[PDB]
């Protein structure tokens, strides 16, 4: 099932205290009005493995504290490095063993680093960047049970922790005797309006729609009546014709490299090659040669 | 423990022990004559003791003498193009000193590897441990032997009698990542108390710069550290010692 990520998803990109400043930042955000895959916890059903990405938005409506955990692995089968995050009754546990995960990994009602600590939105934004794993959080209360609420709540950075993996797959851990949403971030540019205190109260996607591009250009939320030039149109080349001349005769490098009588340094040969289809790439794709340092042209591109 | 390590890893699979949230003391560390090469690129080595970094990186491995000059920004070569690749904007620096003291015992050391030719050039900071086989254009493979399916991992023949350029140089490269983030690691400089409402030269968490420091009525959020201006100049900081 699909639904609308109306405005949720903006998190303080860094450690700053701008006051009443419209600050433009380019980073991984959940694009506005995006489709988020909406998973159920009712009746049979299950919590399938979900593809990770450059970033993942995890918003869950919770009424009975069912959801407790997340999985972040490449194989999820003890072959490869695997992070876990779980929250049992009062303790938050994070472990990164090469765990042997169940095919149905559920919490019923070479090891390395560890640390220990519908009415509710426990919005989370799990992003992995430059060998660092960041988690963002928020706990807005709501009364709309059907779907996501329109509104704007910024996400404070909960915790940062250094694993450094290819995390490419994702799954959550539900207490088994509570729907949760998933969205994938993108490298968009956002204009964030810091309030007096610094609570982000509104933001605009620079690429959502033609109106929104102007707001970024004017660097204002309200734009006055008129015409504004924003971006430049370009027609992308579709094909790329590789047209070269039509002559078929391989250049005689072979005899130079397979020569028998190399000439002395003072009287060196000056074999001239032209009007032929040289093939430098396969020529030097051999490990005999000791020095290949090229000055005027990068060696790979010669072909 | 990094420099006093007992088992240096092979170059094809180098260790990457990480160091953070501690008081590094570089100046005394290189104030020894043992190290043979100390070329520092992003930072003048003397000032290392003074800076504050977000995080550092200890990568160590073993290579022969001729390759130590290769480990460097903007360099090409066998190990350079196949084992350890430094980005051009490398901020940090390398360490070198021989280990004929500790390696090539007397009969041919064979515990250190090479990772010779591989299909494509190695991207910066990638330990590659995949040595299944090489292909060399001509197809016949998985019959792993002998012709144009050449095993990528050579071994160093390390000898006590091996010249001066073939000897084992144990190296370790430090790469500093310097960002506008709470600096975990810093030099060993004690601190004075705080003087307020006065034109004082100030250094906070290694931020640096002067100004007149006064109490602020503005309410930071708990995580935030560095106040900033509309013109993107530092105007407020949080006192590290007392919040």
């Amino acid at each position, epitope marked *: 099932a699909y639904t609308n990520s109306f405005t949720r998803g903006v998190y303080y990109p860094d450690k700053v205290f701008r006051s009443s400043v419209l600050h433009s930042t380019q980073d991984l955000f959940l694009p506005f009005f995006s489709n988020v895959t909406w998973f159920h916890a009712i009746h049979r059903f299950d919590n399938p493995v979900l593809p990770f990405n450059d970033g993942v938005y995890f918003a869950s409506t919770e009424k009975s504290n069912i959801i407790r955990g997340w999985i972040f692995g490449t194989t999820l089968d003890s072959k490869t490095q695997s992070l876990l995050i779980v929250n049992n009754a009062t303790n938050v546990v994070i472990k990164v063993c090469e765990f042997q995960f169940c095919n149905d990994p559920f919490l019923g009602v070479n090891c390395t680093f560890e640390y220990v600590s519908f009415k509710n939105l426990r919005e989370f934004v799990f992003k992995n960047i430059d060998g660092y794993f960041k988690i963002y959080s928020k706990h807005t209360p709501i009364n709309l049970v059907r779907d996501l609420p329109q509104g704007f709540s910024a996400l404070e950075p909960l915790v940062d922790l250094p694993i450094g993996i290819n995390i490419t797959r994702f799954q959550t851990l539900l207490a088994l005797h509570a729907a949760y949403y998933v969205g994938y971030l993108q490298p968009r540019t956002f204009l964030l309006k810091y309030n007096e205190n610094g609570t982000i109260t509104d933001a605009v996607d620079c690429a959502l729609d033609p109106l929104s591009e102007t707001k970024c250009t004017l660097k204002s939320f309200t734009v006055e009546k008129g015409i504004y030039q924003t971006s430049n149109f370009r027609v992308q080349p579709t094909e790329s014709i590789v047209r070269f001349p039509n002559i078929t005769n391989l250049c005689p490098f072979g005899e130079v490299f397979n020569a028998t009588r190399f000439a002395s340094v003072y009287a060196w040969n000056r074999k001239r090659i032209s009007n032929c289809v040289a093939d430098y790439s396969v020529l030097y794709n051999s*490990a*005999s040669f000791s020095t290949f340092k090229c000055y005027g042209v990068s060696p790979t591109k010669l072909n | 423990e990094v420099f006093n390590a007992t088992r240096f890893a092979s170059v094809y699979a180098w260790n990457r022990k990480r160091i953070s949230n501690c008081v590094a003391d570089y100046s005394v560390l290189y104030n020894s004559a043992s190290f043979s090469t100390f070329k520092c690129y992003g930072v003048s080595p003397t000032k290392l003791n003074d800076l504050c970094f977000t995080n550092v990186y200890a990568d160590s491995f073993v290579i022969r003498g001729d390759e130590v000059r290769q480990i460097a920004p903007g360099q090409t070569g066998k190990i350079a193009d196949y084992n350890y690749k430094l980005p051009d904007d490398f901020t940090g620096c390398v360490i070198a000193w021989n280990s004929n003291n500790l390696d090539s015992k007397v*009969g*041919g050391n*064979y*515990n250190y*590897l*090479y990772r*010779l030719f591989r299909k494509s050039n190695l991207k910066p900071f990638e330990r590659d441990i995949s*040595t299944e086989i090489y292909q060399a254009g001509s197809t016949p493979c*998985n*019959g*792993v*032997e*002998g*012709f144009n399916c*050449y*095993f990528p*991992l*050579q*071994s160093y*023949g390390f000898q006590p009698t091996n010249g001066v350029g073939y000897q084992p140089y144990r190296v370790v490269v430090l790469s500093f990542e310097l960002l506008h983030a709470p600096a975990t690691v810093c030099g060993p400089k004690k601190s004075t108390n705080l003087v307020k409402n006065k034109c004082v030269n100030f250094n906070f968490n290694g931020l640096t710069g002067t100004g007149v420091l006064t109490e602020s009525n503005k309410k930071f959020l708990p995580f935030q550290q560095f106040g900033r201006d509309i013109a993107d100049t530092t105007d407020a900081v949080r006192d590290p010692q007392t919040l």
Partner: antibody, heavy 123, light 107 residues
Framework: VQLVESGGGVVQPGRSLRLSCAASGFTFSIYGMHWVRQAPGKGLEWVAVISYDGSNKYYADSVKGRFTISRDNSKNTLYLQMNSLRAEDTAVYYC?????????????????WGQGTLVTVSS | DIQLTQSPSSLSASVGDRVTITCRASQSISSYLNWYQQKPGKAPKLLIYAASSLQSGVPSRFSGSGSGTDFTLTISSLQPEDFATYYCQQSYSTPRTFGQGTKVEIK
């Protein structure tokens, strides 16, 4: 670097025998292992080839089906099971290390060998 | 397949003699021959690889050359400990074969 060959001796015809090639001094898990026999009075004869992991094993036509060479990189030891021994199988056997000379030219060559064990198939 | 041919199959010579042994390959391998010396009752010793390159610790009187199908191992001056059986070993492809073995003795 030491390579230990053992397991030869007097064996009746038509029987079986397992030979041992013990590896020490180098990362044995990274090199193919070969058995080569030299029968008394005549020269060297290539017998078997295995992969560094044992996943790929090949033999000469003179021994196919009869011989089964095995590899255990966990303990880094080489073995050869010869079944249905006969008088033509009476030979000294060498297990020889694979690999290339110290660095580049091209060729993969027979470096450090074993010491030799005779397997005399006699009644 | 690849066949290795040596000539002569055996010979004898005195100390100081220049000995030449030829190994001819079935087809053009040109880069893969390996000369090994075996003293009787002991393990063979690698001498030459790539049919023209010398292995360390081997006296310089040993020398190799050749390419394509014709290969040669030479010793400028035979020595009292040289006298043994020499096998040329191509490494071009599986299954690698040997020659028939050439025993050089005293006269």
């Amino acid at each position: 670097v030491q390579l230990v060959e053992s397991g030869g001796g007097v064996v009746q015809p038509g029987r079986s025998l397992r030979l041992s090639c013990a590896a020490s001094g180098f990362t044995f898990s990274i090199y193919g292992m070969h058995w080569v026999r030299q029968a008394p009075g005549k020269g060297l004869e290539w017998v078997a080839v295995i992969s560094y992991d044992g996943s790929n094993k090949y033999y000469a036509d003179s021994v196919k089906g009869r011989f089964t060479i095995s590899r255990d990189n966990s303990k880094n030891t080489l073995y050869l099971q010869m079944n249905s021994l006969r008088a033509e199988d009476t030979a000294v056997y060498y297990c020889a290390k694979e690999g290339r000379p110290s660095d580049i030219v091209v060729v993969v060559a027979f470096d450090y060998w074993g010491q030799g064990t005779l397997v005399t198939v006699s009644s | 397949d690849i066949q290795l041919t040596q000539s002569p199959s055996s010979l004898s010579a005195s100390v100081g003699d220049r000995v030449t042994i030829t190994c001819r390959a079935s087809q053009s391998i040109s880069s893969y021959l390996n000369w090994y010396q075996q003293k009787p009752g002991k393990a063979p010793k690698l001498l030459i690889y790539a049919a023209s390159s010398l292995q360390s610790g081997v006296p310089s009187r040993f020398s190799g050359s050749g390419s394509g199908t014709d290969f040669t191992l030479t010793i400028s001056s035979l020595q009292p400990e040289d006298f043994a059986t020499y096998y040329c070993q191509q490494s071009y492809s599986t299954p690698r074969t040997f020659g028939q073995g050439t025993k050089v003795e005293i006269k």
